[PDB]
């Protein structure tokens, strides 16, 4: 079996160990919740401010994950980070994900699956995705990494 390795472990333990017939979502955008440091009193009359902004971020982050799935992607490889809330939701959608992927690797993966790097989650479609035969998690002795096969050659 031929292909390349990404020195990145799946972000959630409940994530798939093997993803046959992958549809890679190459992103360059944060999948996190903005956690603003508290500062009430000086933060308007209404206290619920910080409380509802997280409620804001919460649903917006969940929606970004939903949008991903409603595009067929079953694998996410981001150059940016993935929040625990994110990892949770992605894992809930069965999408394999790795975060903070090396810039070099992002391009290597770009031109090898066809996938297009998305900097804006919304401005994405099923066309932006990358194809691969088998995206899976492999154990390189001590650590665990992600392996990619398909769309490279043959």
Give the residues lining the site for a second copy (CB under 8 A): 12-17, 33, 35-40, 47, 50-51, 54-55, 58, 83-85, 88, 91-94
Measured from the CB atom, the residue of 41 and 153 that comes closer to a second copy is 41
Measured from the CB atom, the residue of 95 and 117 that comes closer to a second copy is 95
What's the closest the beta carbon of residue 3 comes to a second copy, in angstroms? Answer: 21
Q: Which residue has the tokens 């001590």?
A: 142
Q: Are 66 and 42 in contact (CB under 8 A)?
A: no
Name residues whose C-beta falls within 8 Å of residue 127's C-beta, 6 or more positions apart in sequence.
116
Q: Are 73 and 52 in contact (CB under 8 A)?
A: no
What's the closest the beta carbon of residue 108 comes to a second copy, in angstroms? Answer: 26
What's the closest the beta carbon of residue 13 comes to a second copy, in angstroms? Answer: 5
Helix (H, G, I), strand (E, B) or coil at 23: strand
d(CA 53, CA 86): 17
What's the closest the beta carbon of residue 17 comes to a second copy, in angstroms? Answer: 6
d(CA 77, CA 85): 17
Q: Write the burial class of residue 111 (CB in 10 Å: 0-12 exposed, 13-18 middle, 19+ buried).
A: exposed
Q: Are 85 and 97 in contact (CB under 8 A)?
A: no
What's the closest the beta carbon of residue 64 comes to a second copy, in angstroms? Answer: 16
Measured from the CB atom, the residue of 67 and 88 that comes closer to a second copy is 88
Measured from the CB atom, the residue of 12 and 23 that comes closer to a second copy is 12
Measured from the CB atom, the residue of 88 and 108 that comes closer to a second copy is 88
């Amino acid at each position: 079996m031929n292909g390349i390795i990404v020195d990145k472990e799946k972000v959630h333990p409940g994530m798939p160990d093997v993803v046959k017939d992958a549809k890679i979502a190459l992103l360059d955008a944060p999948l996190e919740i903005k956690k603003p440091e508290f500062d009430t009193n000086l933060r308007i009359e209404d206290p619920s401010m910080i409380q509802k902004f997280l409620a804001q971020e919460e649903n917006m982050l969940r929606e970004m994950v939903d949008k991903i799935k409603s595009v067929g992607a079953n694998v996410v490889i981001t150059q940016k980070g993935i929040d625990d809330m994110a990892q949770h939701y992605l894992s809930r959608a069965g999408i394999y994900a790795v975060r903070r992927v090396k810039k070099s690797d992002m391009d290597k993966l770009a031109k090898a699956t066809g996938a297009s790097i998305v900097s804006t989650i919304d401005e994405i479609s099923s066309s932006d995705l990358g194809t691969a035969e088998r995206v899976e998690q492999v154990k390189v002795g001590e650590d665990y990494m992600t392996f990619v096969t398909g769309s490279k050659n043959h």
